[PDB]
Structure formats: C-alpha cells, structure tokens
C-alpha cells in the first residue's frame, strides 16, 4: 500500500508491435498506430494520479527477481554458521 507514499508523471504503453520478452526494457516516444508529427503521436499515457486525488489511487510495486543460477554466492541470508 503506497497510497500514502505515492502526480501525473507515470507513463504506460498502449501501442506496440508485440509483447516484450521477460524483463525487456524498450523505450520509444512516437509512431502511434494510424492517427511523425501527424495525429499519430506519443504512445504512452500519463496516469491519472494527483495530490488532490480506491482502485484509482496511486500505488507502488517492486519485484525481487531471485536468480538461482549456479554461481559463487554473493547475497546470503542471516544464518549463523557453525563448525564443520
């Protein structure tokens, strides 16, 4: 619940060629579908959050992508070790 923490400055895509691969980061700010400087314009849309403004209220979500790849461990939990 980021309602108290976190205003029209958040964008989301509406038109695109296809879905992006997992964890893809694409950035483009033009070339709408039909209707460069013509009626076809910026493709993302600003969210309707405002300091003066339940489901229409601003939240925030974060993801902790945990990679279980076989590699030298770097980030470990708070487990106390013992003698072997």
């Amino acid at each position, epitope marked *: 619940n980021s309602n108290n*923490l*976190d205003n029209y*400055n958040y964008l989301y895509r509406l038109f695109r060629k296809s879905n992006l691969k997992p964890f893809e980061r694409d950035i483009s700010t033009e070339i709408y579908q039909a209707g460069e400087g013509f009626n076809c314009y*910026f493709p*993302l849309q*600003s969210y309707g959050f*405002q*300091p003066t403004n339940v489901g229409y209220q601003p939240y925030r979500v974060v993801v902790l992508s945990f990679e279980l790849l076989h590699a030298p461990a770097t980030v470990c939990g708070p487990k106390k070790s013992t003698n072997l």
Partner: antibody
Amino acid sequence: QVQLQQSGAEVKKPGESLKISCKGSGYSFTSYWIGWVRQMPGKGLEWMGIIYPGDSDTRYSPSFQGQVTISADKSISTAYMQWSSLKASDTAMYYCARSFRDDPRIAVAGPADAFDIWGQGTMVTV
Amino acid sequence: IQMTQSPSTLSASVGDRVTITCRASQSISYWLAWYQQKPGKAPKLLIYQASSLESGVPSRFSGSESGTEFTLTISSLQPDDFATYYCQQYNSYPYTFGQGTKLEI
C-alpha cells in the same frame, strides 16, 4: 521562444472591475499545466487561486473563494484575471505561471510544475 | 504551514561554505522545490522534487533534504553567490514559500 507576456502596472480604486493580461506564446498552451502564486510587495507569498484553462475548471482555495476569477481565451492565447470588487488587501505584484516539464516533456506536459517562464510581470495593485 | 529560514542575515566572505535551514512541519517527502531570485527579477527554479537540479543555474548550488528537515548548502561559494533564496513544497496543496535572508557586508 517559450514566453508568457504579462501586462503592465496599474493604480486603481476599490470596487471597479478589472481584466489583466497573461499572453502565452512560443509553446503549447493546451498541453501545459497553469499554476498560480501571488506575491505581496516586500513580504510573503500566498496562493490567490488556480484555474485549469484547458476547460476553465475553477478550483480556488477556501480562503479565496470568489475573490479572483481567472479566464483564458484560446483565440488570442492570453490569460485574464477578473475582479468584481477591487480590494486593498490584494495590491501586490502578481505572477502567472506555466508548467515546467523535466521527465518526457512531450509525453503529457500537464500537471508537471508551476514555474516555467514569466514575462516582465504584472504588478497588480488591486 | 509555517516555513522557517535561518539566519535572517548571513554574513559570509568569498569562499565561505555557509548553510541555511529550511524546516517543514509534516510529510512533504517527495515534491519540494527551491528558487533563486535576484533584486528586481523573477524567481528562477533551483531544485525541484528536492533531489533534481534545474537547468540554467551553475552546478555549484545544491539543496539537501532530511525527512521533514531541509538544508540549502553551498559547498564552494562564489563571489556572486551573495543573494536571497526561498523554499517551496509542492507535495501537498496549498503551496507555501519560505521567508528569505538578506546578505550584507
């Protein structure tokens, strides 16, 4: 050249009707937010009242209900502030403001900030 | 909401690292603005959202934030830095400004 042409200085008596000028030129007026802050001369500042010139949506502070009525005709693209009864408490140096955009200025440019560029300033002695 | 600025007069010499305190009352964490004004000129933006530098001002100026407390800190003073600065919060309406400080010799 993003510019906001403010009108000049004036000296009037209370009770008259008034219309001032804030002409925006050199940018997209319908895409920018319009913030409002008034500056009393030589002292602090107080929000006099804000309007959304996109559709004339009036939203004034509770302490400023009906005292100032802002307008903006998109034909000449200049923002007017109306008075129905001039008051001595509002003699000051007024500053009408556009919105500043720093993150994807061309995305929406609306509801971004309240200080982009000002003209010579209309010191409105009400 | 009352905004306090200290000190009213800040006597500093060329190169003096001086700081002014701009303390708030409640949570305005995200959106907070700073402005600089010259005698007879319009206030120009210095720092918006309390963490981003505005274009047009030399990078020597910097603003700091700490919870409800905020401090404008000039690390390397310039001979032209003797001026007046103000505050502005824009996290929650209405927006209020600071008091200001005059710099004398």
